[PDB]
Amino acid sequence: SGDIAIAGISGRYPESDSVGEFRDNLFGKVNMLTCDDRRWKLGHLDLPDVLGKLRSVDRFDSEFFNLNSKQTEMLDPQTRLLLEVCYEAIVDAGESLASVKGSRTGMYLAISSSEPEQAWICRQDPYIVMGCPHTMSPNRISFFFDLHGPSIAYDTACSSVLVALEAAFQHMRTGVIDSAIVAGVNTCFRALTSKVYQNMGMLGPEACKAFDSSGNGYARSEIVSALFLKKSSDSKRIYCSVVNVKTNNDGFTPQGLTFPSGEIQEQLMRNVYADCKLNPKEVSYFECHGTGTPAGDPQETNAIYRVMCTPDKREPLLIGSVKSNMGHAETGSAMASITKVILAMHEGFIAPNLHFRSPNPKIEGLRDGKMAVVTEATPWSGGYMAINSFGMGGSNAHAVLRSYDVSSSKPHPSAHKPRLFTYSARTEHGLRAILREAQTHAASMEFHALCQASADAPLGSMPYRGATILNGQHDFEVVEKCKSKAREVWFIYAGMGSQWVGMARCLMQLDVFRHSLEKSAAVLKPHGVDLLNILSEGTEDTLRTILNPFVCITSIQVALTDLLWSMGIRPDGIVGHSMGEVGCAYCDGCLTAEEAVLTAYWRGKCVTDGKVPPGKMAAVGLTWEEAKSQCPAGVVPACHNAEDSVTISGAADVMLKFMEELKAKDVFVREVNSSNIAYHSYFMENIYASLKDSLSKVISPKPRTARWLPTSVPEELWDSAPAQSSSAEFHANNLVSPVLFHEALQKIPPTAIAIELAPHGLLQSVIKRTLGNESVCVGLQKRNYADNLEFLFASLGKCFANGLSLNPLACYPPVEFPVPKGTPRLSDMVAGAWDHSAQWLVPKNED
Amino acid sequence: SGDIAIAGISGRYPESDSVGEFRDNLFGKVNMLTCDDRRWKLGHLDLPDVLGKLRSVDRFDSEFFNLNSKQTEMLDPQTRLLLEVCYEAIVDAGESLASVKGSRTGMYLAISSSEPEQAWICRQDPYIVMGCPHTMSPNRISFFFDLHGPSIAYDTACSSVLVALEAAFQHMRTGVIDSAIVAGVNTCFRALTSKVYQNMGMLGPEACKAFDSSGNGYARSEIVSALFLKKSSDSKRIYCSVVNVKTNNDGFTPQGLTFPSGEIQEQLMRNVYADCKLNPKEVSYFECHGTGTPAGDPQETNAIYRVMCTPDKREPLLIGSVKSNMGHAETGSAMASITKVILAMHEGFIAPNLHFRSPNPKIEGLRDGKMAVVTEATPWSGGYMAINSFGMGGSNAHAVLRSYDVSSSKPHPSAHKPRLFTYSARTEHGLRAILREAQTHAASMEFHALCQASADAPLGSMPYRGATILNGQHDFEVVEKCKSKAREVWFIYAGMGSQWVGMARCLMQLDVFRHSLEKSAAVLKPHGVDLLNILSEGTEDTLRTILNPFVCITSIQVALTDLLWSMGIRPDGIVGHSMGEVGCAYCDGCLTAEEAVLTAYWRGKCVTDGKVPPGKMAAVGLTWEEAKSQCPAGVVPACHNAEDSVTISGAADVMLKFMEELKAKDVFVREVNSSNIAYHSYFMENIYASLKDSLSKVISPKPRTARWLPTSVPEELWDSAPAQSSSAEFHANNLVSPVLFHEALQKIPPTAIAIELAPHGLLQSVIKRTLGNESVCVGLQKRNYADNLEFLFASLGKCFANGLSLNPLACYPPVEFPVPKGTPRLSDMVAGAWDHSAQWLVPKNED
C-alpha cells in the first residue's frame, strides 16, 4: 500500500480563526478559554464561567458555496464553517476545486451536537432536513466539492476524529479511495448541555489541568477543523505520514460505563505498534487525551508508561495535552491534537502545556523521570509522534504519525528572481492581504508553486483578481473586481519603428524567450546575420540597415509569442501592422518560427538588393479620405492607423515638401524611421516579384484561421483565395498594399484585453483610443525602460486582474513536488479572505 | 480471509415484536402501517394518518441489563429495545452472555434520532449524558456484553445500516475483530420531525408504493433490529454469507443534494461485483431501496437494469421492496431489507410486495420483462441476493449476500428419542412458552443443541428455571422460581435391597451408561460373572445369590455416576449406605471403576465362600437406643436409617422370634432381602480377614475427600487414619460395622439437592424426611417403572428447575456445527420471555 500523507490542514479554534493564530496562541502560552457572554449570560445556571469559544459562528460566504439565504439560515453553523475549512485544507494541500472535482475522495466527519435542530425544529422549515441532520454535514461537503468516496458522520464521543481517521486510513489502504477529508466539529450553543455535564461532575471550574494534581474535570470548548489526506506519491505537500490508527472499546468496567480502562487502552496501543511493526520506544512525543480528570489522567499515563517507556529507552518520553491550552472540544477534540502535532512537525518545536504546576503523584512515569511534561517550547528533531483520544463510553482510539523531514538541498534557481504572483479572492481586502503574504514569502518558490496550483477557480467563484511582483525593485499591486463574463484576448503585432538598441537584453533572462531567439539566430546564421550580437551588442547604426530591423522585430515577436504560450495565454483574435503580419502568421500556426524569421529576412534582403529610390514615411493628423485627397503626386496613404492618424509614404523630396505644407496648416506631422524606404507604396511594386519568388522557396502555404484579421487586404476581400492562405503571395502583397489597421481594430470588442507584441509598444495610444475606455491595452516591452521583465509582469498582472487566465510560473523551471518541510501554510491566508459581510442565524441559548 | 456469516438475527418491526411475527405479516400480506394515536393525535399538524409503529416502546427488562430505574428512565427507548434485541440475536446464533464476554466483538450501530435528548434535556438530569447521545447506544451494548471491538454510531441517513455492515465486514476481513453486532434503529416520537419531512414533499399519504406508477413519497416507520456476525468456521448457525459491501456518494447533482444519481449508483454496483469477482447475472433476487418516489424508483431500477440484466441473463431479475409492507424506517431501513432476505434464504420463499398495481412506465426492466416485481410468495432455490440502501444526502450502499444451503443428509440419531429440555427465563409465562416451543420442535436435535449452547446464563440473571421431556410418552413440565444462591448437590449411594429384575434395560439406551456397564462386564468376565446377561436376562432366582446383587448394584452405581458426570453434574457431598460406600469411593476418585466392581465382587465372593450361618435383616420402627436396649442376644442394630427407623441384623431363628415380638407390640417390621445373610453384625467378623486380604490385592489406597461423609465410621473417628483412606481395611470394616446413615444425613444442608444413585430409589422417603421440606430429593430409577429414561429425565429436570446446572444433551451424540439450513429461530422465543412488568419514560410529542 502507498504511504498515506496529511497533505493539507485548516481550522477554527477558540480565539483562533486559522491554524496560524492557533499556533501563535499555543507558542505564546495564551489561554484560549475565555469568560464572556458570547453563548449565554455569565453565571447562567451556575455554570463554569470558562468556555472555549470560536470568535465567529454567524459568518459564512454562502454565495461561494452556491447556497441561497433560506438554505443558509437553516444550515448548522458547524457545517457552514466546515465548508470554508474544507476549502482552506484543499488549498493548503496545493489542490483546487477543479483538482478534487469528480475524485474518489472520501468525507469522514466527527459530529455529535444536534443543538441547531433542537433550537430550530419548531419553525417547521423544510430546509432543516437538508441543514441540521448529522449526515447532511459530510454529504453537503461531498455535494459541493463533487466527491464520490464514502460520506459518513461518526459518533464515538471524544474519540470520533481518530475513529473517522481509522476509517479513511483503511479505505485508502484497501484502494476504496485515493484521497480523504477527515474532519471534526463541536459547538456549545445550549447552556443545558453544559448543565447536564456539570451535574455528571465532568466539568472543572477553570481549565483542563492535564497531569496536574489539581485536575478536577475538563472545560468545554468549540472546534471546526479538517485534514486533506492523499497518497505520498500524489501529494504536492506532506506534513506527515499516518503510520497506523486503531480503535477498541473498554467493554465492561466494574466502576461504571464512564470509567476509563487503562488495561484496554494498553491493549489497543500494543496492537497498533505490533500491526505496523514499529517499536513503541521510537515515539519521542505523545499527545495524550489528557482531560485533567483525577481518574482519567493516571489510567491513561500509566498505560502509556507500560507500553512506551521500555527498559532500554534512555530519553524520557515527552508528553502533552492541547486541552490544557484550549479546553476539550469533545467530539472534535483530536483535531486540536493532530493540529498541534502537525505544528510541531512543521515548526520543529513542541508547544507547551498550560496549568501544570504539581505532577499528579499517581502518574508513575513523572515520578521516576521516564516521562516529562512539555512546559516550554521544546525542540523536536523528527521521527514519530503518538495521539490518544478516548470516548466517555469506552470507545478508545490511538494514532501514530511520522514527520516529513525532506529538506531542499539547494534554493530554486528562481527563488530570488522577479516573479509575477497572481491570485483571486472573494473580497478586495482578502486579496490585498494574500498579495502581502506572498511578498512576505517572496523567497519561497515552493510557496508560490502551491499558491499557483491551488489558484484554479472558476471566473465567477472568485470575483476579485489581482497581482504583485515578488523580488521586484518597485512596488506593484493591481486589484480589480472582475465580471463573470470572459473577455476576448487579442494579440496585436506592431511593425516598423518598434526596434531599439538593446531591445532583447532584459527578457533573455527567461529561458523560453532566450531559447526562441537562439533558434531564430541558428536559422539566420547561414545567411550571414548574427541575430544575438545585433540584439545584445547592436548600436543605433546597426539598426539603420534595412535588413536588421526586420529580423529583430520578427524574432522578438516569435519569442514573445512563445513566452505567452508557455504561460497558457492564447489569443481569441490576431491583428498585424505591416511586417507584424509575419508575427500574426506564426501565432495563427500558418508559419513555423523558421519560416517566419526567413520571411522577415527575405523581405529585408529583397528591399536592400532592389536599390529602391530614396523614400520617406510620416504619421500625419489626417483622416484616410483627407490623406487620399491631399496627397500630392508621388505620395500615398500607406497606413490607416486611427480615424485621425494616417502614415503617408512616397518619394523623399515630395514627402519633405508635403510634410512642411502640412506643418504650415497646423497638421500633426511625425517622420517614421523607415531607413529611407517608402513602404506600402508603388515603390515596393518593383520588389514584389523578387520577394514572391524568394518566399515561395520558404513558405509552405497554410489556411489563415478566423482569429487573424488581415490588414493587408480590404474586408470585402477577406474570403478571397489570396486572403484565405498565408502564402508567399500574401506576404509579398503585404509589402505593397496599404495597412488597413483601423478597419481591423474596429472589429475588436470594446471589452477586449489587447496585448501588443513588439520590442516597444508604439501602438498603445492608437489601440486604447480605438477600443475605448472599457478595454485593457498593454505592451510587453517599453523602449529604454529600466527593467522590461518587471514591465512585462506588470502588463500581464494588469491583464490577469482584468480576467486573463495565465500561469506566470511557467516561464521559470518547475518546482518538484512534494515541497520540502517548512514550506509556509496556505490555509491561513484563505481563512482571512472570505466574504463575511452577511450575518446568519445561530442557535440561541434556552431561556 | 475466512467467509463472514450472519449467524443470528432479531428485531422489533411495526406490528411485529419478533422476526417470526414480521415473517407472518410479510407472507400474510399484512400492511404493517397503522392509523392510530400511539405517537400523536390523528390529524395533528395535517400529517399523514399512516405511520409504521412498534407495538411497545415503554417496556424493558432493566434488571437483566443491571440498569437502575434512574438510568432506565433517561435511556433512549431505541437503546432499551436494542439491548434486548442484541441478546436475542446472540442467543439466535447459539451464543450466550458467557461466550461473548471479553470477545473481540465490534458494535456497529445505525442511529440518527436525537428526539429523546430533545424531549428530556430540560430536566437537567445527569443520566441523560449516559442515556441519549448516539455514541452511548453502541457503548452501552459493548459495556453490558463486555465487547472489546470498535463501538461506533453511524449516520448516512437511509443507508446507515449497510455503511455499518461495510465497516464490520472490513474489520472482520482485516482481522481487527472475530465477530460483530450490526444494528439499526429508528423511532418517530415527535410530530414536528414528520412535519419537516412532509414540508420537504418526501411523505406519501398512504404507503411506500414501490415500483408503482402511483408512487408519491414514502411512509415513515420504526425499527429496532440487530445481526450477529461471525466467521463461518466459528459459527453454530449460518443464515447467509456476506459476499461484499461497498459505499460511495453521488457528489454534485445539478437537480440538487436530495436528487438520487442512478449513474453513481451504477458505478457503486459495478465496483461491488468487480471487487469480489462475481458476475452480476448470478443475483436472482434484488431487495431494492424502493421508497415509492417518482424520481428515486426509476433512477435506482434503471441503474440495476444496466448492471444486473446482462444480455445473456435468460431469467428475469426478481425485485422487491420491504418498504411496501412496513414503510420506510429511515436510518434503520436496511435492517428490514436484510431480515426479509434472511427470511427468504431460510424459508425458501420471497415475501411479496404490497401496493403494486400498475408498473411505473419509466422502469425499463419492467416494460421489457427483464425485471419482475414479486407480488406473491415466490419460491427461491438459493444463490445470491443483492440489497440497495441510498441516503437522502447521496450516501449510497450496496450489499451482496449468499444463501447457506447445507442440508443434513440424515436425521440425528437422537432426533426422535426422549430428551430432557432445560431452559431459564425472566418470567414464568415466558418460560412456559419456551418449553411449548421446544415441544413444537421436538424432532429437531439441532434446535435443541442451539438452545442448550445459548442457555449458559448466570443463576441470578434468569430467575425462572424449568424443564420438559421431548418425544416422551407422558407430558412432563416443571417450572420453579430459583433463589440466586447456589444449592449443594449430594450424591447418596443406596445399598442392598435396591436390586430388581431388568434394572439396567431402559438406561442401556444411553451410550455412556451402556459403555460403563460393558467395561464392568469385561472386568467381571475372567471371574465367571456375565454381568450383562444378569442385568438383561436375569430372573428373581438370578438375584437370590449373595454375589449377583453386589456386582449389579455397584456396576449400576458406577454407570449412573458416569452418566451424571457426562452431563456436568458434580457432587458437593457424598454419602453411602452399606455397600453404597463402594460407589462413594468411585465418585470421590478413591477407586477406579475396575477397583470398585472388583471390591463388590470380592465382598460377595468372600461372604459366599465363608459359609456364614443363616441370618436375617429387618427394618423396624425403633430409635437407635431403643434398638440397642430391646435387641435380644444374637441380634444387633445394623443400620441407623432415620430417627424412627433402624435395620436390625442377627441369627435367623432369633430374628424371626424378635420380629414377631415387635409386631405383637404394634412396632413396624419389614424384612429386608439380604439373601439370608446377617450383614453389619458379628457374623461378618469371620469374613473380615479373607475380605481384607482379597481387597489388598485390588485396591490402591487413596485419601478420601471432605465431600464423602463415611457411614461405616463414627463421626469422632472421621479424622482417624483408617477413615482418611479408601483402603482394603476401610471396605472390609464397612461389612462388619453398623451403617451410621442418619448421622451422615444430618450433616446435609436442608436446602440441598439430594440424588439417590441406585437401581431403585429405596431411600427416597428416609432422605426426604431427614432433610425436610426445603430439600429436593430424587431417585434416578424406580423398580418396574414403565420408562426409567423418562423417570431419570423427570428427576434431573426437577433438579434443574431447583438450581442444578447440567447439559442434558451430553448423554447423546453431539450435534455438528454449523446447523443445517431451516433450523428454527431462537430469537422469537426470547423476545416473548422478557420481564415487561415495568413501564418506562418515553418522549412525548410536542404540544
Sketch the domain layout of chain A as residue ranges: 4-403, 419-486+809-817, 489-609+694-801, 613-676
Question: Can you name the CATH fold of A4-403?
Answer: Peroxisomal Thiolase; Chain A, domain 1 (3.40.47)
What does the alpha-carbon distance between residue B3 and residue B9 come to, in Å, rounded to a whole number?
18
The values of phi and psi at residue B51, to 5°, are -150, 130
**A148 contact B CB<8A:** yes
Q: Is B166 helix (H, G, I), strand (E, B) or coil?
A: helix
H-assigned helices in A368-507: 428-440, 445-454
What gap in Å lies between CA A824 and CA A448, rounded to an integer?
10
A556, exposed or middle or buried, with CB in 10 Å at 0-12, 13-18, 19+?
buried
**Helical packing angle, B685-695 and B593-609, nearest 10°:** 140
Cα atoms found within 13 Å of the Cα of residue A345, Cβ hemisphere only: 32
DSSP state of A260: -
Rounded to the nearest 5 degrees, what angle is found at the Cα of A532, between the Cα atoms of A526 and A536?
Answer: 155
What sign has the CA pseudo-torsion B613, B619, B620, B626?
positive
Q: B594, B838 in Cβ contact below 8 A?
A: no
Residue B105 distance to chain A (closest CA, Å): 10
Cα–Cα distance for residue pair B126/B75, rounded to 1 Å: 11
Partners of B575 in the β-ladder:
B492, B709
Cα separation, A219 vs A205, whole angstroms: 7
Q: Name the maximum alpha-carbon separation found in chain B.
A: 116
Contacts of A1 in chain B (CB under 8 A): none
Quick check: B124 contacting A, CB < 8 Å? yes
Do B496 and B445 contact (CB within 8 A), yes or no? no
* Three cell numbers, residue B435: 418449553
Cα distances (angstroms) measured from residue A66 to each of A62, A302, A460, B256: 6, 50, 11, 11
Closest by CA to B401, choosing from B274, B245, B237, is B245
Distance between CA atoms of residues B535 and B518, nearest Å: 11
Dist. CA B342–CA B336, nearest whole Å: 10
Active site residue A289: yes
Active site residue B158: yes
* Residue in the block written with cell 420408562: B787
Residues B726/B701, Cβ–Cβ less than 8 Å:
yes
Name the DSSP class of B631. Answer: P
DSSP A481: E
**What DSSP assignment string belongs to A707-739?**
TEE-SSS-GGGTTSTTTTEE-HHHHHHHHHS-B
Q: How far apart are CA A785 and CA A760, in angstroms?
A: 10
CATH code 3.30.420.40 for B613-676: no
**A597, A559 contact by CB (below 8 A):** no
Q: What is the CA radius of gyration of chain B?
A: 35
For B565, residues 6+ apart whose C-beta sits below 8 A from its C-beta are none
Whole-number Å distance between alpha carbons of A397 and A389? 5
Determine the Cα angle at B656 with ends B652 and B659, to 5°: 135
Question: Contact at 8 Å (CB) between B172 and B408?
Answer: no
Instruction: Cell numbers for B454, please give them.
Output: 445459548
Q: Specify the pairing of strand A283-287 against strand A384-390.
A: parallel
Backbone angles phi, psi at A835, to 5 degrees: -85, 90
Which residues, 6+ apart, have CB-to-CB distance to B660 below 8 Å?
Answer: none
User: CA of B597: how far to CAs of A415, A424, B71, B712, in Å?
Assistant: 102, 101, 61, 19
- Pairing, β A702-703 against β A395-403: unpaired
Intrachain domains B4-24+31-403 and B489-504+522-608+698-791 with the same fold: no
Which amino acid is it at A77? P
Contact between A320 and A285 (Cβ < 8 Å): yes
Q: How many of the other CB atoms lie within 10 Å of CB of B1?
A: 9
CA distance linking residue B104 with residue A278, whole number of Å: 23
Q: Which of A249, A469, A212 is nearest to A358 (CA)?
A: A212
CA–centroid distance for A144 within its chain: 19
- Is B742 assigned a catalytic role? no
Q: What are phi and psi of A398, to 5 degrees?
A: -135, 135
- CA dihedral over A637, A641, A642, A647, signed as positive or negative: negative
- In chain B, DSSP finds a helix count (H) and a strand count (E) of 29, 29
Breaks after residues in chain B, judged by C–N over 2.5 Å: none
A488 contacts A748 by C-beta, under 8 angstroms: yes
Contact A533/B at CB under 8 A: no
* Among candidate residues A599, A568, A567, A572, the one with its CA nearest the CA of residue A585: A599
Beta-strand pair A573-576/A489-493: parallel
- CA atoms within 13 Å, Cβ hemisphere of A545: 19
Closest of A383, A711, A405, A429 to residue A573, by C-alpha: A711
* C-alpha–C-alpha distance, residues B561 and B756, integer Å: 10
Instruction: State which amino acid sits at residue A368.
Output: D
CB contact under 8 A, A251 and B102: yes
Going by the DSSP 8-state scheme, the letter that residue A674 receives in this structure is -
CA neighbor of B351 nearest in space, from B133, B24, B78, B4: B24
Residues A735 and A31: their CA atoms lie apart, in Å, by 78
**Using CA atoms in the order A615, A620, A623, A629, what is the torsion angle rounded to 10 degrees?**
-50
**Whether B825 contacts B83, CB under 8 Å:** no
A745, A770 Cβ separation under 8 angstroms: yes
Name the active-site residue from A171, A289, A346, A731. A289
Distance from CA of B456 to the nearest CA of A (A): 19
Distance between CA atoms of residues A506 and A510, nearest Å: 9
Q: Is the peptide bond before A818 cis (omega within 30 degrees of 0)?
A: yes
How many CA atoms are closer than 13 Å to the CA of B248, on its beta-carbon side? Answer: 28
CATH code of the domain occupying B4-24+31-403: 3.40.47.10
**Crossing angle (nearest 10°) for helices A511-524 and A547-566:** 140
Phi, psi of A6 (to 5 degrees): -85, 110
Phi, psi of A696 (to 5 degrees): -65, -20
Give B197's contacts in chain A (Cβ within 8 Å).
129
All cell numbers assigned to A832: 482571512
Q: With beta carbons less than 8 A apart as the criterion, state whether A552 and A601 touch.
A: no
Q: Decide if B179 contacts B229 (C-beta within 8 A).
A: yes
Cα–Cα distance, A99 to A94 (Å, whole number): 9
- Alpha carbons A267 and A275: distance in angstroms, whole number: 12
Residue A538 CB partners (closer than 8 Å, separation 6+)? A501, A502, A548, A552
Per DSSP, which regions of A259-394 are E strands?
283-287, 317-320, 349-350, 371-373, 378-379, 384-390
Distance CA A315, CA A312 (A): 9
Q: How far apart are CA B211 and CA A840, in angstroms?
A: 41
**Contact: A136, B393; criterion CB under 8 Å:** yes
State the pairing for strand pair B105-110/B151-155.
parallel
The residues, any chain, with a CB within 8 Å of residue A719's CB and separated by 6 or more, are: none
Helices (H), B567-592: 580-587
| Closest-CA residue of chain B to A177 | B248
**What SS3 state is found at B287?**
strand
Under the phi-then-psi rule, with left for phi > 0, alpha for psi from -120 to 50, and beta for the rest, what region is A708?
beta
Sign of the CA dihedral running A19, A24, A26, A32: negative
Q: Which residues are bridge partners to B419 per DSSP?
A: B470
CA-nearest residue of chain A to B113?
Answer: A133
Task: Check CB contact of A161 with chain B, cutoff 8 Å.
Answer: no
- Cβ atoms of residues B47 and B62 within 8 Å: no
Burial A140-149 (b: 16+ CB within 10 A, else e): bbbbbbbbbb
Q: Which of A134, A171, A328, A742 is catalytic?
A: A328
Type of residue at A769: R
- Cell numbers placing B429: 409465562
CATH number 3.40.50.300 given to A419-486+809-817: no
CATH number corresponding to B489-504+522-608+698-791: 3.40.366.10
Grid cell 470548548 is found at A221
The answer to whether the CB atoms of B118 and A121 lie below 8 A apart is yes
HSE at residue A668, side-chain half, CA atoms within 13 A, is 10
Kindly report the backbone phi and psi dihedral angles of residue A602, in degrees, each rounded to the nearest multiple of 5, phi listed first. Answer: -65, -35
Q: β-strands B349-350, B635-642: how paired?
A: unpaired
User: Which neighbouring-strand residues pair with A731?
Assistant: none
Query: Chain B neighbours among A 438-477 (CB < 8 Å)?
Result: none
Q: Searching chain B, which residue's CA lies closest to the CA of residue A128?
A: B196
> Which amino acid would we find at residue A203?
L
Rounded to whole angstroms, the Cα distance separating B51 from B33 reads 5
**From CA A344, how far away is CA A380, in angstroms rounded?**
7
Residues 6+ apart with CB under 8 A from A225: A9, A10, A11, A12, A13, A85, A183, A184, A185, A332, A335, A336, A338, A339
List Cα–Cα distances, A583 to A558, A593, A594, in angstroms.
Answer: 6, 9, 12
How far apart CA B594 and CA B284 sit, in angstroms, is 63
Residues A219 and A497: their CA atoms lie apart, in Å, by 76
All 3 cell numbers of residue A349? 518545536
Check CB contact of A182 with chain B, cutoff 8 Å: no
d(CA B46, CA B50): 12
Residues whose CB is less than 8 angstroms from the CB of residue B475 and which lie 6 or more positions away in sequence, other chains included: none
Chain A, window 193-212: residues with a beta carbon less than 8 angstroms from a chain B beta carbon:
193, 195-197, 199-202
Class of domain A489-609+694-801: alpha beta
Amino acid at position A6, single letter:
I
Q: Are B309 and B365 in contact (CB under 8 A)?
A: yes
Q: Which residue has the cell 432543516?
A: A128
Using an 8 Å Cβ cutoff, are A62 and A69 in contact? yes
How distant, in Å, are the alpha carbons of A160, A363, B66 from that of A164? Answer: 6, 30, 31
With b for 16 or more beta-carbon neighbours within 10 A and e for fewer, the A88-121 pattern comes to: bbbbbbbbbbebbeebbbbbbbbbbbbbbbbbbb
Nearest partner of B733 among B581, B561, B547, judged by Cα: B581
- Report how far residue A115's alpha carbon sits from residue A101's, in angstroms, rounded to the nearest whole number: 32
* Residue A159 DSSP SS3: coil
Q: At A353, is the secondary structure helix, strand, or coil?
A: coil
CA angle B217, B223, B227 (to 5 degrees): 125
Strand B378-379 vs strand B349-350: parallel, antiparallel, or unpaired?
A: antiparallel
Across the interface, do A121 and B151 touch by the CB < 8 Å criterion? no
- From B831, B18, B6, B818, select the one nearest B341 (Cα to Cα): B6
